[PDB]
Swiss-Prot record, chain A:
Coiled coil: none annotated. DNA repair protein that may operate in a postreplication repair or a cell cycle checkpoint function. May be implicated in interstrand DNA cross-link repair and in the maintenance of normal chromosome stability. It is linked to Fanconi anemia complementation group F: A disorder affecting all bone marrow elements and resulting in anemia, leukopenia and thrombopenia. It is associated with cardiac, renal and limb malformations, dermal pigmentary changes, and a predisposition to the development of malignancies. At the cellular level it is associated with hypersensitivity to DNA-damaging agents, chromosomal instability (increased chromosome breakage) and defective DNA repair. It comes from Homo sapiens (Human). Changing residue 61 to R: Reduced monoubiquitination of FANCD2. It is found in: Nucleus. This is Fanconi anemia group F protein. The chain holds residues 176 to 355 of 374 of the full protein. Belongs to the multisubunit FA complex composed of FANCA, FANCB, FANCC, FANCE, FANCF, FANCG, FANCL/PHF9 and FANCM. The complex is not found in FA patients. In complex with FANCA, FANCG and FANCL, but not with FANCC, nor FANCE, interacts with HES1; this interaction may be essential for the stability and nuclear localization of FA core complex proteins. Changing residue 99 to A: Strongly reduced monoubiquitination of FANCD2. Changing residue 97 to A: Strongly reduced monoubiquitination of FANCD2.
UniProtKB/Swiss-Prot annotation, chain B:
Highly expressed in testis and thymus. Found in lymphoblasts. This is Fanconi anemia group G protein. The gene is FANCG. Keywords: Cytoplasm, Disease variant, DNA damage, DNA repair, Fanconi anemia, Nucleus, Phosphoprotein, Repeat, TPR repeat. One of its GO terms (biological process) is DNA repair. It is linked to Fanconi anemia complementation group G: A disorder affecting all bone marrow elements and resulting in anemia, leukopenia and thrombopenia. It is associated with cardiac, renal and limb malformations, dermal pigmentary changes, and a predisposition to the development of malignancies. At the cellular level it is associated with hypersensitivity to DNA-damaging agents, chromosomal instability (increased chromosome breakage) and defective DNA repair. Belongs to the multisubunit FA complex composed of FANCA, FANCB, FANCC, FANCE, FANCF, FANCG, FANCL/PHF9 and FANCM. The complex is not found in FA patients. In complex with FANCF, FANCA and FANCL, but not with FANCC, nor FANCE, interacts with HES1; this interaction may be essential for the stability and nuclear localization of FA core complex proteins. The complex with FANCC and FANCG may also include EIF2AK2 and HSP70. DNA repair protein that may operate in a postreplication repair or a cell cycle checkpoint function. May be implicated in interstrand DNA cross-link repair and in the maintenance of normal chromosome stability. Candidate tumor suppressor gene. It comes from Homo sapiens. The chain holds residues 303 to 462 of 622 of the full protein. It is found in: Nucleus; Cytoplasm. The keyword Nucleus applies.
Length: 165, 150
């Protein structure tokens, strides 16, 4: 309705929604909306531009959902892939490995676990080929960047590549 | 000790009671317990190595190890006994001597020979994937220490 009306931009509408109502529900829905086939894909094509417009909500979006959801989001909209891998790529690098417990952990209470990160990359690998190469190469290029070690203790990224077999 | 080695290189029972019959076997605490060539040559190299004669130490150790492994044909020349160090602790002493020489391409044909014989023993480290419970004896972790410093 508002798209055809063209009075205000949908951006404004969505930003105001986001501020007014319960966020946890809202995000999940948008999520589900990006996946419904077209009915009259203008809807999805507005919301992706809204989301790329607001990174900070997309930081809580990508954080709050389960893995398969956001994975099939990607195979549908190649426009979200390189930014999403960006988010975790930077979430990986802000941990540290303790030798007492052989596990990566974060400093603050709000830092994603090894298991939730493993999970999300887990899902992205069990996906179509047009995302597999992308995620694989984004990890290999971040491995080489952080010393091309071939053992744990050392690179979060080595840990992953290994953990996949 | 060098004389002792050469001495232990070189080697009748009366139908009568001589004194020998009544003497006890020496203890290890005695001054009369004298080990074997192999057990001694190990004395030399060990005591050489606490001083800092790495070069001397190194020769001595290789000669120890030569004796022990290469003996299939002659009389058995044995290891230092299990009040002494265990046979893999001897390959480590060899390597630490070789590093303080600066023979590091040798301090690796040591650490590699050792884990190539005992692979079948070593832990499979698939606990690496599944991450206290599994088991690896300190001489392995140590062979990776000295493989490293080389």
């Amino acid at each position: 309705e508002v798209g055809k009306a063209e009075a205000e931009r949908p951006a404004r509408f969505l930003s105001s929604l986001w501020e007014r109502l319960p966020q946890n529900n809202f995000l999940k829905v948008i999520a589900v909306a990006l996946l419904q086939p077209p009915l009259s894909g203008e809807g999805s094509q507005v919301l992706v531009h809204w989301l790329l417009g607001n990174s900070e909500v997309f930081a809580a979006f990508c954080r709050a959902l389960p893995a398969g959801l956001l994975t099939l989001v990607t195979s549908r909209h190649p426009a979200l892939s390189p930014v999403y891998l960006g988010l975790l790529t930077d979430w990986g690098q802000r941990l540290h490995y303790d030798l007492q417990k052989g596990i990566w952990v974060g400093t603050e209470s709000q830092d994603v676990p090894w298991e939730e990160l493993h999970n999300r990359f887990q899902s992205l690998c069990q996906a179509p080929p047009p995302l597999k190469d992308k995620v694989l190469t984004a990890l290999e290029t971040c491995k080489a960047q952080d010393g091309d070690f071939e053992v744990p203790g050392l690179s979060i990224w080595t840990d992953l590549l290994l953990a996949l077999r | 000790l060098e004389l002792l080695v050469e001495a232990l290189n070189v080697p009748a029972p009366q139908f009568l009671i001589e004194v020998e019959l009544l003497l006890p076997p020496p203890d290890l605490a005695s001054p009369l317990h004298c080990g074997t060539q192999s057990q001694t040559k190990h004395i030399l190299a060990s005591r050489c190595l606490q001083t800092g004669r790495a070069g001397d130490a190194a020769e001595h150790y290789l000669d120890l190890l030569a004796l022990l492994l290469d003996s299939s044909e002659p009389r058995f020349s044995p290891p230092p006994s299990p009040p002494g160090p265990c046979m893999p602790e001897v390959f480590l002493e060899a390597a630490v001597a070789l590093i303080q020489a600066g023979r590091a391409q040798d301090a690796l044909t040591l650490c590699e020979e050792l884990l190539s014989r005992t692979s079948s023993l070593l832990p499979k480290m698939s606990r690496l994937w599944e991450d206290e419970l599994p088991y690896c004896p300190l001489w392995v972790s140590a062979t990776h220490l000295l493989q490293g410093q080389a």
